[PDB]
Amino acid sequence: GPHMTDLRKLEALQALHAELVAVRQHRFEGLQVLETLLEEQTDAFKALIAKPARDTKDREALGKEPKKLKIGEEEYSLNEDFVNDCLKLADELDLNEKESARILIDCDAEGDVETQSRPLWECGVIRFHQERKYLLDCMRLILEIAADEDIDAGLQESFGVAAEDKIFGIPPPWERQVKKFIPRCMEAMKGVRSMLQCMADKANARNMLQQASLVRPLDNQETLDFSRLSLVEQHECLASILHAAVQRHHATIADFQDFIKILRKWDKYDHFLIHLIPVLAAYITEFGSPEGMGDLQQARRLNDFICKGGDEDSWALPVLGAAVRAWWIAEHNGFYLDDTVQDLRGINLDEEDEQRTKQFLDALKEGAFDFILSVAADCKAQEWQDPSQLGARQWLQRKIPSLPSEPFPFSHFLQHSLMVHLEGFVDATISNLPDVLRKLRTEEDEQRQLRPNHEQDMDLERFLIIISYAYEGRPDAAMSFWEDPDSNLAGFLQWASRRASTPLVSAFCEMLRCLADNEECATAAHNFLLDEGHQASGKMKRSQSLTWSQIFKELEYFTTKVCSEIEPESALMLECYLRLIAKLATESEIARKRLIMDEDFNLVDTILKLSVGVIPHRLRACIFYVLKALMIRKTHEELDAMWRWVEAWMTNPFPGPQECMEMMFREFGTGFEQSNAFIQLLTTLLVPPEGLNSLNDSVPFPEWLGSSIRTLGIEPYVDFVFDVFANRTKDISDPSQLRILRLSCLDFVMVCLVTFNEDLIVLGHESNISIDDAMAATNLATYVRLHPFSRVMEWLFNEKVITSLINTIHQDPISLGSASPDSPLVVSILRAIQVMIKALELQETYLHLVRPEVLRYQGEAGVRRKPVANAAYSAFEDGILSHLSLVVDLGKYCNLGHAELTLACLKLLEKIST
């Protein structure tokens, strides 16, 4: 890449980082400049963010002779103001006065005071932390490159030795008082933790006075927030590096013991702790697993150090210790599976598998699986919710305290690493402790049979949920269930599907849904739920309880009950069933067709019945999302069939059918969850089978739709979406849901506009319609009538609808810039703007061609579709440009750094401006 010759420490580290990213993204154009920067940071690399201690000699010097500063080779001149910033920086960071001065000179020189507009001493803080973070992330990248199997073996290995040498301080194979790496790494992480704490304490005290007196943010609050986030990211990088050191066999038993001792003293469930969980897993896999070291005289000695010798106050977080014991036992019991690979003579398999099973089951009662599940849930926790899975994996009890509410999202490399180890743990217990799982099941069944009103243990359920996270979004890994029916994991799947309690069935369907993230996996799950070649004479499938048959019999029953309250467990189960149906349908064409064209299941017809009855909104939402799932891909026959289905129940839900339709629309638009889902459904039903952005001379639904009782076309449906967007959104309190719902509405609109083939209509006017044999002038003329384009345009000329577009676009620019480009906030604004652009691009074809044809038609018909357009607006500009906020916001947003958004603001501004 392009760089200057004499880069200062930070800029140098940033350069190296950029080169490392390149190599990591398979760009080897700058390997030569990468190496030059590597050797340039050798010292810093071995120093591992070591922080020079504050000193009296330099303090006494700085103030007494505040004139000429000499650092290393060069000379600078101090002004009484600069010298004060050094003392301020040295205090804030408890840093060497000289090192502080150096940092401030790099700040002044590079002039990041103006680049970040902050006091000089604050810039020092930021630079100090930037250097640390980049240094550590460079190491993480080097290790990550050393493990990249998709690059030249030579590079992969040379980066390996580089990592061994520069990071872990292990000389290369061709050569050779020091403190071993891991001990240094642990001290480094310790420093970071304490610096965050010390920083938090000081900040708390100062904020307390701030909020009490001035009730406004601290002057350096931005720098504070940044320093916290960094420190946490630093620890995360160190935790990743440590994890690498362990796997690379650089750890000693002592290191393993010192680590466990550190976990034993750990007295807070926080982000730092979760960073160490992968490290723990590696340590367990190294010193106790079958795959790791195999000195059992030691692997068992450690067992007594981990489990036995249990003092009552040995763990500050007893629940953590439980998780540690469980994890260890799961991996350590793998030694005793076979003899072809291991020597098991002298071992009391009987008494031990007894005592092991006991102390493991005890761990579960102590909260082992509540801790592990909570760690997985928090690590994979997303920032915004997918409305189609609200409640999923959220119904099991949790005694583990929430993570401190912080803006500390876990890096992908940490999340992935953790999931990989959970996969191992899941595999270990399933294959090493099947006995324990059978007992859990019997224990829980026995519980809800004899103590229906008492707290039921849910550790078996938790286990399935843990599995769901481990394999979530990883089909390659998930195939280990669908590959070999004789395998352990595949067996566990079949064992779980046996007759189960409602909670365990829900937990199972939750699991399956996360084991179907592609065509192959989804198809496998689909075939699994079938009675495959098994109408009779069942080997696997006779004992199997959970099947499509049971699912559709359970659904079919609940429909007769509700149409003549549902119990929480029942509701949950039905919701898990539906979410599962939806998942497979969208991921598997085989599954989709079967589900939609099966007379035994009668899926569509039955779930539509269910929606008519009085059911919880979240359950009806699940129904709508299934209907959408069956339409994600589609043909014309299926599509027409679906529209026929929907119309049937909208009008005849078992007095006037159109009055019944009013009834159903008013209900479906009630509340976020179900209104959002229904609008999502209608949107999908309008996306042609040929795909969005297609050009065909046909409306995407049965032309004769509504022919029986109403105005032909889907105007009642379009009117519904706009009534939500325009009026019903007023009832949504939660901002993020308001945004999601608005986005849904706007996507519906966008689809109505995009699928309108204007090029086809314009060509018609001049030629086909008036000056030639016109068989098809009618054909297109009818198209112009039925396509939602007319009605959608008519709505876009409505006062309220325009106001809502403005309201959607008008948002707090500060929180807008902080938002993610994919967040509903940004995207909902973008989509609103994009609707305005599209409207402007099509309003001519609408005003001089479509509108008059539609107004003409009804003249003789009779129906005067209740007016929605505002006669005051002769053009779309007359409406939107009456809101001065609009053009102002467009200008503002260009400066918020959201490329796609800005790009849209410009497109619209050009159409508006003079």
UniProtKB/Swiss-Prot annotation:
GO terms for cellular component: nuclear pore inner ring. Belongs to the NUP186/NUP192/NUP205 family. Component of the nuclear pore complex (NPC). NPC constitutes the exclusive means of nucleocytoplasmic transport. NPCs allow the passive diffusion of ions and small molecules and the active, nuclear transport receptor-mediated bidirectional transport of macromolecules such as proteins, RNAs, ribonucleoparticles (RNPs), and ribosomal subunits across the nuclear envelope. Due to its 8-fold rotational symmetry, all subunits are present with 8 copies or multiples thereof. Part of a tetrameric NUP192-NUP170-NIC96-NUP53 module. Keywords: mRNA transport, Nuclear pore complex, Nucleus, Protein transport, Translocation, Transport. Its main location: nucleus. GO terms for molecular function: structural constituent of nuclear pore. It is found in: Nucleus, Nuclear pore complex. The lineage of its organism: Eukaryota, Fungi, Dikarya, Ascomycota, Pezizomycotina. Functions as a component of the nuclear pore complex (NPC). NPC components, collectively referred to as nucleoporins (NUPs), can play the role of both NPC structural components and of docking or interaction partners for transiently associated nuclear transport factors. NUP192 is located to the NPC core at the nuclear membrane and is essential for de novo assembly of NPCs. It comes from Chaetomium thermophilum (strain DSM 1495 / CBS 144.50 / IMI 039719) (Thermochaetoides thermophila). It comes from the Eukaryota. One of its GO terms (biological process) is nuclear pore organization. This is Nucleoporin NUP192.
